[PDB]
């Protein structure tokens, strides 16, 4: 199966605060594994899953200094951006980064990622070639030119193809993957006509499809139960007496094949 690593980083400035708040979250296979928060009493990268406790003290020391370096980088970048957009003092501002790698089932690099947002909107991104930059904003051209002239892309490329892949291999070995199939049931709610609501519960990961049918409806967005698993439902308003004409189908990666269900 395929694999991935991501670091999602955020710095926020506020009218009062002397220094921005910086938060970094690391993910392996879309599951949080490390976290740094500058608001902590003694800010350090901390493990977020049990399998990371295997890493010794020098690992945490190095990563913590990386994060403190990022915190400085974000502080300076936030200041530079304020200038680029002619934003005055007295506002709140946000700078975000996503970076990392996707591996195929063979554990080889499929794609590197490096994108940034200012005020929640795309600012600059490293293209899939890992050599050139896309920047929409006129203000972002200043940064694009600066990074073209400094050769920033070659260095990010080296990280993405080297370190990102190599350390993801090490984390997949130490973390040795699993999924939880959805348990489904249909509820019955008489109204004017009855609402049949098909429930999917206890599943992981969150990606799932629910359909009602012969031929292909209200729903909710997939939501966390709070215990590591997810929930979803879909409903249809259906004639009283004729509820057996309708069948709910649940598609999830953990299923040997799609579940088919009806009101019983």
């Amino acid at each position: 199966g395929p694999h991935s690593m991501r670091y999602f980083e955020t710095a926020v400035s506020r009218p009062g605060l002397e220094e921005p708040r910086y938060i970094s979250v690391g993910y392996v296979d879309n599951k949080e594994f490390v976290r740094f928060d500058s608001d902590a009493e003694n800010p350090r990268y901390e493990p977020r899953a049990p399998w990371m406790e295997q890493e010794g003290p020098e690992y945490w020391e190095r990563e913590t200094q990386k994060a403190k370096g990022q915190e400085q980088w974000f502080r300076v970048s936030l200041r530079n951006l304020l200038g680029y957009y002619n934003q005055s003092a007295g506002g709140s501002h946000t700078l975000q980064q996503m970076s990392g790698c996707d591996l195929g089932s063979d554990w080889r690099l499929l794609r590197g990622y490096l994108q940034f947002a200012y005020e929640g909107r795309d600012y600059i991104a490293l293209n899939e070639d890992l050599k050139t930059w896309t920047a929409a904003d006129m203000a972002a051209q200043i940064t694009r030119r600066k990074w073209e002239q400094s050769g920033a892309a070659e260095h990010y490329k080296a990280y993405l193809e080297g370190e990102c892949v190599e350390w993801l291999h090490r984390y997949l070995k130490n973390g040795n993957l699993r999924t939880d199939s959805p348990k489904a049931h249909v509820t019955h709610h008489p109204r004017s006509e009855v609402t049949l609501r098909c429930w999917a519960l206890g599943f992981y990961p969150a990606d799932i499809t629910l359909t009602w049918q012969g031929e292909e409806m209200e729903l909710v967005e997939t939501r966390p139960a709070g215990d590591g698993t997810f929930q979803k439902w879909a409903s249809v308003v259906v004639p009283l007496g004729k509820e057996q004409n309708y069948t709910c189908r649940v598609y999830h990666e953990g299923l040997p094949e799609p579940l088919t269900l009806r009101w019983e």
Partner: peptide, 9 residues
């Protein structure tokens, strides 16, 4: 393995 950025914006 956290990324360490290069040139500032």
């Amino acid at each position: 393995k956290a990324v360490s950025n290069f040139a500032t914006m």
